[PDB]
CSV table of C-alpha atoms and ligand atoms in Angstrom, one decimal:
chain,number,residue,atom,x,y,z
A,1,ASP,CA,-5.3,-22.9,7.7
A,2,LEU,CA,-7.4,-25.2,9.9
A,3,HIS,CA,-7.6,-27.6,7.0
A,4,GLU,CA,-3.8,-27.4,6.8
A,5,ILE,CA,-2.9,-27.8,10.4
A,6,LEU,CA,-5.0,-31.0,10.9
A,7,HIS,CA,-3.6,-32.5,7.7
A,8,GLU,CA,-0.1,-32.4,9.1
A,9,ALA,CA,-0.5,-33.1,12.8
A,10,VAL,CA,-2.1,-36.6,13.2
A,11,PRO,CA,-0.4,-39.9,12.5
A,12,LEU,CA,-2.3,-42.3,10.1
A,13,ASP,CA,-2.1,-46.0,9.7
A,14,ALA,CA,-2.3,-47.3,6.1
A,15,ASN,CA,-6.1,-48.0,6.3
A,16,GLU,CA,-6.8,-44.5,7.7
A,17,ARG,CA,-4.7,-42.9,5.0
A,18,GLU,CA,-6.3,-44.8,2.2
A,19,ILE,CA,-9.7,-43.6,3.4
A,20,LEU,CA,-8.7,-40.0,4.1
A,21,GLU,CA,-7.2,-39.7,0.5
A,22,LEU,CA,-10.7,-40.6,-0.9
A,23,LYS,CA,-12.3,-38.0,1.4
A,24,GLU,CA,-9.7,-35.5,0.3
A,25,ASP,CA,-10.8,-36.0,-3.4
A,26,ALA,CA,-14.4,-35.4,-2.3
A,27,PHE,CA,-13.5,-32.2,-0.5
A,28,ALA,CA,-11.3,-31.1,-3.4
A,29,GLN,CA,-14.4,-31.4,-5.8
A,30,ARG,CA,-16.5,-29.4,-3.3
A,31,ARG,CA,-13.9,-26.7,-2.8
A,32,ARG,CA,-13.4,-26.4,-6.6
A,33,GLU,CA,-17.2,-26.0,-7.2
A,34,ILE,CA,-17.2,-23.1,-4.6
A,35,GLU,CA,-14.0,-21.5,-6.0
A,36,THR,CA,-15.6,-21.6,-9.5
A,37,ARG,CA,-18.6,-19.6,-8.2
A,38,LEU,CA,-16.2,-17.2,-6.4
A,39,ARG,CA,-14.2,-16.6,-9.6
A,40,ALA,CA,-17.3,-16.0,-11.7
A,41,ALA,CA,-18.6,-13.5,-9.1
A,42,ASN,CA,-15.2,-11.7,-9.2
A,43,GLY,CA,-15.4,-11.5,-13.0
A,44,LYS,CA,-18.9,-10.1,-12.7
A,45,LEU,CA,-17.6,-7.5,-10.2
A,46,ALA,CA,-14.7,-6.6,-12.5
A,47,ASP,CA,-17.0,-6.2,-15.4
A,48,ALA,CA,-19.6,-4.1,-13.5
A,49,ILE,CA,-17.0,-1.8,-12.0
A,50,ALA,CA,-15.1,-1.2,-15.2
A,51,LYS,CA,-18.5,-0.2,-16.7
A,52,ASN,CA,-19.9,1.8,-13.9
A,53,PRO,CA,-18.1,2.5,-10.6
A,54,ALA,CA,-21.2,2.5,-8.5
A,55,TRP,CA,-23.1,-0.1,-6.4
A,56,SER,CA,-25.4,-1.3,-9.2
A,57,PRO,CA,-27.8,-4.3,-9.1
A,58,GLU,CA,-25.0,-6.2,-10.9
A,59,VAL,CA,-22.5,-5.3,-8.1
A,60,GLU,CA,-25.1,-6.2,-5.5
A,61,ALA,CA,-25.9,-9.6,-7.1
A,62,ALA,CA,-22.2,-10.5,-7.6
A,63,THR,CA,-21.5,-9.4,-4.0
A,64,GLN,CA,-24.2,-11.8,-2.7
A,65,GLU,CA,-22.5,-14.5,-4.7
A,66,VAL,CA,-19.1,-13.7,-3.1
A,67,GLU,CA,-20.7,-13.6,0.4
A,68,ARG,CA,-22.3,-17.0,-0.2
A,69,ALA,CA,-19.1,-18.6,-1.6
A,70,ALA,CA,-17.1,-17.2,1.4
A,71,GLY,CA,-19.6,-18.8,3.8
A,72,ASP,CA,-19.8,-22.0,1.8
A,73,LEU,CA,-16.0,-22.3,2.0
A,74,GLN,CA,-16.0,-22.0,5.8
A,75,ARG,CA,-18.8,-24.5,6.2
A,76,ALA,CA,-17.3,-27.0,3.7
A,77,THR,CA,-14.0,-26.9,5.6
A,78,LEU,CA,-15.6,-27.6,8.9
A,79,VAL,CA,-17.7,-30.4,7.5
A,80,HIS,CA,-14.5,-31.8,6.0
A,81,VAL,CA,-12.8,-31.7,9.4
A,82,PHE,CA,-15.5,-33.9,10.8
A,83,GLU,CA,-15.5,-36.2,7.8
A,84,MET,CA,-11.7,-36.8,8.3
A,85,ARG,CA,-12.4,-37.5,12.0
A,86,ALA,CA,-14.8,-40.2,11.0
A,87,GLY,CA,-12.1,-41.9,8.9
A,88,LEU,CA,-9.9,-42.4,12.0
A,89,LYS,CA,-9.9,-45.4,14.2
A,90,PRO,CA,-11.7,-44.6,17.5
A,91,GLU,CA,-8.4,-44.8,19.5
A,92,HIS,CA,-6.9,-42.1,17.2
A,93,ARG,CA,-9.7,-39.6,17.6
A,94,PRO,CA,-8.6,-38.0,20.9
A,95,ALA,CA,-5.3,-36.9,19.3
A,96,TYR,CA,-7.2,-35.4,16.4
A,97,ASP,CA,-9.7,-33.7,18.8
A,98,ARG,CA,-6.8,-32.1,20.7
A,99,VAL,CA,-5.3,-30.5,17.6
A,100,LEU,CA,-8.7,-29.4,16.3
A,101,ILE,CA,-9.8,-27.8,19.7
A,102,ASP,CA,-6.4,-26.1,20.0
A,103,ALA,CA,-6.5,-24.8,16.5
A,104,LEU,CA,-10.0,-23.4,17.1
A,105,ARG,CA,-9.1,-21.8,20.5
A,106,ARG,CA,-6.0,-20.1,18.9
A,107,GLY,CA,-8.7,-18.8,16.5
A,108,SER,CA,-10.8,-17.4,19.4
A,109,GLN,CA,-7.8,-15.6,20.9
B,1,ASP,CA,-5.7,-8.5,0.2
B,2,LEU,CA,-7.8,-6.0,-1.8
B,3,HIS,CA,-7.7,-3.1,0.8
B,4,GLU,CA,-4.0,-3.8,0.8
B,5,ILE,CA,-3.4,-4.1,-2.9
B,6,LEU,CA,-5.0,-0.8,-3.5
B,7,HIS,CA,-3.2,0.9,-0.6
B,8,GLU,CA,0.2,-0.2,-1.7
B,9,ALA,CA,-0.2,1.1,-5.3
B,10,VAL,CA,-1.9,4.5,-5.3
B,11,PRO,CA,-0.5,8.1,-5.5
B,12,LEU,CA,-2.0,9.9,-2.5
B,13,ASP,CA,-2.1,13.6,-3.3
B,14,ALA,CA,-2.0,15.1,0.2
B,15,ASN,CA,-5.5,16.1,1.3
B,16,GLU,CA,-6.6,12.8,-0.3
B,17,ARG,CA,-4.2,10.9,2.0
B,18,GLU,CA,-5.5,12.5,5.2
B,19,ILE,CA,-9.0,11.5,4.1
B,20,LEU,CA,-8.0,7.9,3.1
B,21,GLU,CA,-6.3,7.5,6.4
B,22,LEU,CA,-9.5,8.5,8.2
B,23,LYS,CA,-11.5,6.0,6.3
B,24,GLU,CA,-8.9,3.4,6.9
B,25,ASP,CA,-9.8,4.0,10.6
B,26,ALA,CA,-13.6,3.6,10.2
B,27,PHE,CA,-13.1,0.5,8.1
B,28,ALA,CA,-10.5,-1.0,10.4
B,29,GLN,CA,-12.9,-0.7,13.3
B,30,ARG,CA,-15.5,-2.5,11.1
B,31,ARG,CA,-13.0,-5.3,10.4
B,32,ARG,CA,-12.3,-5.5,14.1
B,33,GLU,CA,-16.0,-6.0,14.9
B,34,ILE,CA,-16.3,-8.8,12.3
B,35,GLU,CA,-13.1,-10.5,13.6
B,36,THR,CA,-14.5,-10.4,17.1
B,37,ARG,CA,-17.6,-12.3,16.0
B,38,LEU,CA,-15.5,-14.8,14.2
B,39,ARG,CA,-13.2,-15.4,17.2
B,40,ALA,CA,-16.3,-15.8,19.3
B,41,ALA,CA,-17.8,-18.3,16.9
B,42,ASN,CA,-14.5,-20.3,16.9
B,43,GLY,CA,-14.6,-20.2,20.7
B,44,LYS,CA,-18.0,-21.7,20.7
B,45,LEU,CA,-16.9,-24.4,18.3
B,46,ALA,CA,-13.9,-25.3,20.5
B,47,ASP,CA,-16.2,-25.4,23.5
B,48,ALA,CA,-18.8,-27.6,21.8
B,49,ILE,CA,-16.2,-30.0,20.4
B,50,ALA,CA,-14.6,-30.4,23.8
B,51,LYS,CA,-17.9,-31.4,25.3
B,52,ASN,CA,-19.0,-33.6,22.4
B,53,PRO,CA,-17.1,-34.0,19.2
B,54,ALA,CA,-20.1,-34.2,16.8
B,55,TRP,CA,-22.2,-32.0,14.6
B,56,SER,CA,-24.4,-30.8,17.4
B,57,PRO,CA,-26.8,-27.9,17.5
B,58,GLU,CA,-24.1,-25.8,19.1
B,59,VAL,CA,-21.7,-26.7,16.2
B,60,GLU,CA,-24.3,-25.9,13.7
B,61,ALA,CA,-25.1,-22.5,15.3
B,62,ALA,CA,-21.5,-21.6,15.6
B,63,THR,CA,-20.7,-22.6,12.0
B,64,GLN,CA,-23.5,-20.4,10.8
B,65,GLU,CA,-21.9,-17.5,12.7
B,66,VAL,CA,-18.6,-18.2,11.0
B,67,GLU,CA,-20.4,-18.3,7.6
B,68,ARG,CA,-22.0,-14.9,8.2
B,69,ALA,CA,-18.9,-13.2,9.5
B,70,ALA,CA,-17.0,-14.5,6.4
B,71,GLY,CA,-19.7,-13.0,4.2
B,72,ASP,CA,-19.9,-9.8,6.1
B,73,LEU,CA,-16.1,-9.2,5.7
B,74,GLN,CA,-16.4,-9.5,1.9
B,75,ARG,CA,-19.3,-7.0,1.7
B,76,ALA,CA,-17.6,-4.5,4.1
B,77,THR,CA,-14.4,-4.6,2.1
B,78,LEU,CA,-16.2,-3.9,-1.1
B,79,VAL,CA,-18.2,-1.0,0.4
B,80,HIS,CA,-14.9,0.4,1.8
B,81,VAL,CA,-13.4,0.2,-1.7
B,82,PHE,CA,-16.2,2.4,-3.1
B,83,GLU,CA,-15.9,4.7,-0.1
B,84,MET,CA,-12.2,5.4,-0.7
B,85,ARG,CA,-12.9,6.0,-4.4
B,86,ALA,CA,-15.5,8.8,-3.7
B,87,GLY,CA,-12.8,10.7,-1.9
B,88,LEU,CA,-10.3,10.8,-4.8
B,89,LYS,CA,-10.0,13.6,-7.3
B,90,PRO,CA,-11.4,12.7,-10.7
B,91,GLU,CA,-7.9,12.7,-12.2
B,92,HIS,CA,-6.8,10.0,-9.7
B,93,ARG,CA,-9.7,7.6,-10.1
B,94,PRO,CA,-8.4,5.8,-13.3
B,95,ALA,CA,-5.3,4.5,-11.6
B,96,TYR,CA,-7.3,3.4,-8.6
B,97,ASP,CA,-9.9,1.6,-10.8
B,98,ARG,CA,-7.3,-0.2,-12.8
B,99,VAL,CA,-5.6,-1.6,-9.7
B,100,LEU,CA,-9.1,-2.6,-8.4
B,101,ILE,CA,-10.3,-4.1,-11.6
B,102,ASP,CA,-7.1,-6.0,-12.3
B,103,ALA,CA,-7.3,-7.4,-8.8
B,104,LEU,CA,-10.8,-8.6,-9.3
B,105,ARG,CA,-9.7,-10.1,-12.7
B,106,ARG,CA,-6.9,-12.0,-11.0
B,107,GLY,CA,-9.5,-13.2,-8.6
B,108,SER,CA,-11.5,-14.6,-11.5
B,109,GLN,CA,-8.6,-16.7,-12.9
C,201,LIG,CL1,-20.6,-25.9,2.4
C,202,LIG,ZN1,-8.2,-32.1,3.7
């Protein structure tokens, strides 16, 4: 969501946009690496539960991988938000900051 | 999604249903506590970014709180899934499991 709202809501000149597209590829690779771990953990959970519907060491280990991936996703998104900010011209950063802060405060309500 | 996928697709006896509704209460309170911490963390992030838009110690600490709440929500959900299962008659567990297992499979693809 946060990732989504910022993407739309700030105007970019051609130089900013060129750089932000590169940063978006970088973020896409990171998000895909995390999603891959998440999918594998989910497969491990499916396997374990189909075999034995109890909280086995296999379920515990897979759950830890899910927890980690869920955390990594949030951190990666926040890091990416600051990376995009760094791609903007100084004079464009206040507009970005307003949207970011607003989005975050709507998330504290 | 999971807690919701399972709920929307299971035949709830009668005495089972009363019990599931009870556990839907205890879990919902647990979700509410986790959400509270997440909103708080977001609030800290908005506050920090307004004072200084940078990866400061406050941003790092708040991000960590977000990561942990994200992880906690996944673990709590899974525990609740096993909780609801324990309450079902033996005859009713296969349908529940196949909804749960398929969901996790989908989440691996
Ligand atoms: Cl990360
Ligand atoms: Zn992006």
